[PDB]
Amino acid sequence: MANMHQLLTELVNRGGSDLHLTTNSPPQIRIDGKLLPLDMPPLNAVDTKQLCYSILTEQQKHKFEENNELDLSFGIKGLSRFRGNVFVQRGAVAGVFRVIPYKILSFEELGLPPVVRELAEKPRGLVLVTGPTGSGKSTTLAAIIDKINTDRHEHIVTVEDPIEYLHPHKSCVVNQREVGADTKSFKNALKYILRQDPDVVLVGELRDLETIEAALTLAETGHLCFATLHTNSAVQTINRIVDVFPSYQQPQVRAQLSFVLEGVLSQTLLPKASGTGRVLAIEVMVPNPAIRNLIREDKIHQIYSQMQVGQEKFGMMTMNQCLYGLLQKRHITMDVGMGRSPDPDELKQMLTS
Amino acid sequence: PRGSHMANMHQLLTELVNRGGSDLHLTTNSPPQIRIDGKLLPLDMPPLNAVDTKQLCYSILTEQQKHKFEENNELDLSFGIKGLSRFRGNVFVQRGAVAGVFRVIPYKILSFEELGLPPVVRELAEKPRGLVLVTGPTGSGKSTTLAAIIDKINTDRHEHIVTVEDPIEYLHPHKSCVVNQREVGADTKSFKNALKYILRQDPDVVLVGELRDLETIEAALTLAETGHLCFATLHTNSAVQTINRIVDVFPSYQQPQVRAQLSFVLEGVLSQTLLPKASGTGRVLAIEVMVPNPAIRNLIREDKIHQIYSQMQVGQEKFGMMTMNQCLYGLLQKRHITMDVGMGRSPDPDELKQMLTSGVR
Amino acid sequence: ANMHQLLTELVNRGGSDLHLTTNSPPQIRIDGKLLPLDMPPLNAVDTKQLCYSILTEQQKHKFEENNELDLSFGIKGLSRFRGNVFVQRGAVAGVFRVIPYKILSFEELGLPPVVRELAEKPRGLVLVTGPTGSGKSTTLAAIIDKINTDRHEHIVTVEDPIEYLHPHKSCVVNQREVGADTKSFKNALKYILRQDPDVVLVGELRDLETIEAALTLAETGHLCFATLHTNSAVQTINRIVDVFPSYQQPQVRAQLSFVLEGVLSQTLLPKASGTGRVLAIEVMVPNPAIRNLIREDKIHQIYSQMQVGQEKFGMMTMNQCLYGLLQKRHITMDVGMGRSPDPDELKQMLTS
Amino acid sequence: LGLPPVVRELAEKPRGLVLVTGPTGSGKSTTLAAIIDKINTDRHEHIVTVEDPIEYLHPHKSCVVNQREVGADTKSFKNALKYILRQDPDVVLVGELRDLETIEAALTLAETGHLCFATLHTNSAVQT
Numbered sequence A: 001m002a003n004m005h006q007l008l009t010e011l012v013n014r015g016g017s018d019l020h021l022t023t024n025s026p027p028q029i030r031i032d033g034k035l036l037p038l039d040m041p042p043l044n045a046v047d048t049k050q051l052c053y054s055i056l057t058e059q060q061k062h063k064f065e066e067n068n069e070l071d072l073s074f075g076i077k078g079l080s081r082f083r084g085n086v087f088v089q090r091g092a093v094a095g096v097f098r099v100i101p102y103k104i105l106s107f108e109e110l111g112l113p114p115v116v117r118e119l120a121e122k123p124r125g126l127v128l129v130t131g132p133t134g135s136g137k138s139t140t141l142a143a144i145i146d147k148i149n150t151d152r153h154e155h156i157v158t159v160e161d162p163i164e165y166l167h168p169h170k171s172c173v174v175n176q177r178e179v180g181a182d183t184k185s186f187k188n189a190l191k192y193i194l195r196q197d198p199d200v201v202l203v204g205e206l207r208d209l210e211t212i213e214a215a216l217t218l219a220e221t222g223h224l225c226f227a228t229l230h231t232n233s234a235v236q237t238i239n240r241i242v243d244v245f246p247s248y249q250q251p252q253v254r255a256q257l258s259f260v261l262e263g264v265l266s267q268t269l270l271p272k273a274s275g276t277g278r279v280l281a282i283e284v285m286v287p288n289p290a291i292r293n294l295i296r297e298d299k300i301h302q303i304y305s306q307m308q309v310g311q312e313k314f315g316m317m318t319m320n321q322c323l324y325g326l327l328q329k330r331h332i333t334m335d336v337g338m339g340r341s342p343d344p345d346e347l348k349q350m351l352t353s
Numbered sequence B: 001p002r003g004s005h006m007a008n009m010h011q012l013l014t015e016l017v018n019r020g021g022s023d024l025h026l027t028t029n030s031p032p033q034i035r036i037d038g039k040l041l042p043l044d045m046p047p048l049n050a051v052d053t054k055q056l057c058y059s060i061l062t063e064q065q066k067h068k069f070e071e072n073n074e075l076d077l078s079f080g081i082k083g084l085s086r087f088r089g090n091v092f093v094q095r096g097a098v099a100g101v102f103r104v105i106p107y108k109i110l111s112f113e114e115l116g117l118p119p120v121v122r123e124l125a126e127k128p129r130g131l132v133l134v135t136g137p138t139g140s141g142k143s144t145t146l147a148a149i150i151d152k153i154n155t156d157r158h159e160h161i162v163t164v165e166d167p168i169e170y171l172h173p174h175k176s177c178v179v180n181q182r183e184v185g186a187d188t189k190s191f192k193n194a195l196k197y198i199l200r201q202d203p204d205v206v207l208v209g210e211l212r213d214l215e216t217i218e219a220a221l222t223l224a225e226t227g228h229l230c231f232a233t234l235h236t237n238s239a240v241q242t243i244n245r246i247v248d249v250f251p252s253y254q255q256p257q258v259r260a261q262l263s264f265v266l267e268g269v270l271s272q273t274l275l276p277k278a279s280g281t282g283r284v285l286a287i288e289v290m291v292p293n294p295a296i297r298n299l300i301r302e303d304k305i306h307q308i309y310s311q312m313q314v315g316q317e318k319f320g321m322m323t324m325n326q327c328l329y330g331l332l333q334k335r336h337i338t339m340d341v342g343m344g345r346s347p348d349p350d351e352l353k354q355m356l357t358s359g360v361r
Numbered sequence C: 001a002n003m004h005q006l007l008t009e010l011v012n013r014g015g016s017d018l019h020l021t022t023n024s025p026p027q028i029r030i031d032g033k034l035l036p037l038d039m040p041p042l043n044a045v046d047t048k049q050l051c052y053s054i055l056t057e058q059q060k061h062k063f064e065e066n067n068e069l070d071l072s073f074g075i076k077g078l079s080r081f082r083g084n085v086f087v088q089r090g091a092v093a094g095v096f097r098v099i100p101y102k103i104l105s106f107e108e109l110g111l112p113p114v115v116r117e118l119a120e121k122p123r124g125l126v127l128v129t130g131p132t133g134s135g136k137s138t139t140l141a142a143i144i145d146k147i148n149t150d151r152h153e154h155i156v157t158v159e160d161p162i163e164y165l166h167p168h169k170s171c172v173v174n175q176r177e178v179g180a181d182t183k184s185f186k187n188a189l190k191y192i193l194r195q196d197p198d199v200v201l202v203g204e205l206r207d208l209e210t211i212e213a214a215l216t217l218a219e220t221g222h223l224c225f226a227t228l229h230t231n232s233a234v235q236t237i238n239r240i241v242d243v244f245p246s247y248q249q250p251q252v253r254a255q256l257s258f259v260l261e262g263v264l265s266q267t268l269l270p271k272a273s274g275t276g277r278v279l280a281i282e283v284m285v286p287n288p289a290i291r292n293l294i295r296e297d298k299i300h301q302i303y304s305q306m307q308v309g310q311e312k313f314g315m316m317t318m319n320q321c322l323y324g325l326l327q328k329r330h331i332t333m334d335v336g337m338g339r340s341p342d343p344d345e346l347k348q349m350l351t352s
Numbered sequence D: 001l002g003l004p005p006v007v008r009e010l011a012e013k014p015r016g017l018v019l020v021t022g023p024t025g026s027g028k029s030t031t032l033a034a035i036i037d038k039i040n041t042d043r044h045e046h047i048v049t050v051e052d053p054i055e056y057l058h059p060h061k062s063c064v065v066n067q068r069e070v071g072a073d074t075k076s077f078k079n080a081l082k083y084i085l086r087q088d089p090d091v092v093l094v095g096e097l098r099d100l101e102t103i104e105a106a107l108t109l110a111e112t113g114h115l116c117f118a119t120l121h122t123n124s125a126v127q128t
Ligand SMILES: Nc1ncnc2c1ncn2[C@@H]1O[C@H](COP(=O)(O)OP(=O)(O)O)[C@@H](O)[C@H]1O
Pocket: A017, A109, A110, A111, A112, A131, A132, A133, A134, A135, A136, A137, A138, A139, A140, A269, A278, A279, A280
């Protein structure tokens, strides 16, 4: 048998993101998005209770037994910090434990093109980093924020659920607010953010109509606003913001977006061709004079054609062009690149070319 | 006058399985009774009293389950007997005494073809993300279809499946996935509470049960929008009727967001019903299948929900779609259902009449 | 002593309810009408002692807190009764109903032979309707008891309260009383499908949620019995349809057309002898024409179908039942005309 | 402040609801302080402000200016506006129209012959 400390050590050593402990299965660790069972006997109810309780204080145990649910974060000296969730299934304890990295990675390490570096220099605008869950959005935002913290003498405020990467003060003052502990909600944090003299604000996901307008106000009133969406492309991102409003407001919102939008990044993590690790495929839309006019005229669909031809001038890049490069460098397999292309026949034409 | 040598609960359930029974009954003033081929037959035992039924039923409850049963006088649960079988138990109260009913739960989950599900349902189980809705009235095969879908995912993927059920019906032992199943009223306090913590539990596939209220619908859309495969049920009878229920439960001012979200995340709508079989034994599945294509996704954003039915009529060949009448037509050519049942259940009897008279079949 | 002697009078004269209130002698309900006993009137002292003489100590403290109290109690050698005690004009008053225990047979109840066939249906919805005290529970108790004798199936009843008691015969019979065995009609039906039933009695179709349960039970392969307070078959079907919002009446009409197997609308009318009551019942048994009429929303046309499906299917309109009681001279013309839903047609039907 | 001449004429309106709206930090309180100061300078009336918190202070000039801070001077907007009609006011500043309760109170003040000033976070007249 192995205890909780040995299991967490193996999760870190193998570069995994998540450790799962549940009954009738061995401990499993998520490596590169897919689960892998550890070389251990299947757990029983005693094991899951013993392993999960081994990292809890007495009050955390008593709170867990009152609700059969528990969110927490904890540290193991000399290893890493982890965020754990404990719950109950089939009458037995179960647990999931997520890694919180100590180290912020650089732009080049993450495979982010240099145009993302320039967005950290934007004085006032809205920059959106979008993608499905676990597509690298938070790491890219943390990479941009750390460069601003390093390079500017301004005030950075983040509202996060939860706070992942920690930003010690460099040249900036960095305040990080965790929803549910430091602040009641995004709505509450955003209710007072304009009285907090911010320069750059990270608001998390544009969850509802009220948060879209709040992010638009910051970027339009002279601030640099960072936000995320769960869209898969630059065009789909712009459409989702506009389409949630009633049609007769929509004209105003397109005009505000055209002025404040300074960059849209859409990420996805694909399994590498070597069989270890994941590689970043990203679509980058940086508004040029042509695209900002297309936004105001509700000619959003001509943007894709403009992104296809504005790469050398503005550092723009369609998703298919990014997949193309990962195919040329043999970073991804042929099936993986096809499986994510929004238009596989277009990418096929590029490949035969 | 007989005492001190009563059959054990373990022994009663062991005899239930060995004799091929479907259900074990424990109630006062009756001996244990077993259902064989649909009919109850008493075992050659003395009749049970209230002490017997409570002691037998309590022998298979955890201490937390006894307290939950005593608070509501109702209790559904599942348990395993090592080396024998799994069981669904229901404990209730009648005439002031404990009563219990215990159903046999087979080890083998039925396949798509055994259930009469078209091959398009198979492909919905391969979706990497999105929302899949399985609809129909109570007992129209919704849970069984979902059990078949999750089981293929359990077999094929190395991902995390979490289900929230009230109660847990079909049980999913681990295959290639890690499967966590939370039972409302025992494992978790409520649907609302389980969904509040699910995103911190690293899920890939989630079963959320019925889209009961506005809170749950918003939770399922978030799961489906954030890159997850989310399974849910409604009690609507058609793909078009299903979409109308989702949008219309929301205030009018946020229907635009709901309509936009559905067009992106919706990957399939299955509307089932069980009709009495033509053979005279059992019921057979008639299912309407809507798989959103770019054309259907546009009608959702443009508030043209009504026009989707015309698209399903002509999406059978290309998209594997199937209107309810198109399924009833196929069941009639196969002589699986009678004519009165086919016409009497058709949502549009005029279309089905036209479909049969083609002379081209 | 005094109250125990009073309740024996109630049983011996065959009454249904005993009334105790100030400025009146004790009154007992016989055949639907109150009859005063040849006794002195009760004062406030009398009603208090009589009602309190049958109360437990916990019940005494409970009644004075609310001026209301529900209870049931037994009198050794007589019967059990359900009582309600309350306060009026500053004094205690009480009403006591008899809980019948002996189930009468189908023929003793005046039920036609077609009702006997209903207890042999394997699945569907059967509705027994009528005002309060129109004979629904005896009819239901007779039906349930025959199933218990003839079948090896599972009978579950949910009652508020339990009236007739059904010991196990060939069936397993579980009886759940609301407020003791189960919290509510809604809670019992939440678990009923997981209790492996074959025949279920759900009581009154009082709201939308219970109707969905009865229709679900009936189309999922069970025989479900339920009650309404309507006085005819058409009236009964309309009440089920009109409870729902307009946009789902097509689904409910479709459900009803398949699962409905019988509608019994009863009323107890005084016999021409002047002592006792005879049952008048409208029976609607769906034939292919009627089932189509329900789904096609031609519900008003159903009454015409019942008048001519009589010989073949055992059907009987209320007027046809009233004709027979008039032809056999069991009830008076005033009683028969008073219950006829269309007295002029009965007149045409009576004289040919 | 760059305010057009119509803003000064609004400060001379005898009655009604005048709304100065915009996002936070768009100059709403500064414009209101200039209006109230002009009213305070030119009129012999009673000004009551309900602010959360009090920003600009208005010492008495020709008007009587009472400024109530919520949480210290008064328990809430809801409680302060419940008694504002009993305080013989001519001009009332109620702050932001944050909920249904204050909006109906501000509409009642402006309906009963007072000049009421309030704010919203809207960006245009129609949107307001
Ligand atoms: N550019 C990247 N390249 C490779 N891996 C990345 C990259 N960005 C993030 N990751 C890794 O993906 C996993 C999830 O990252 P995260 O940013 O938290 O996802 P999300 O943005 O959807 O919340 C982590 O293990 C992280 O190290």
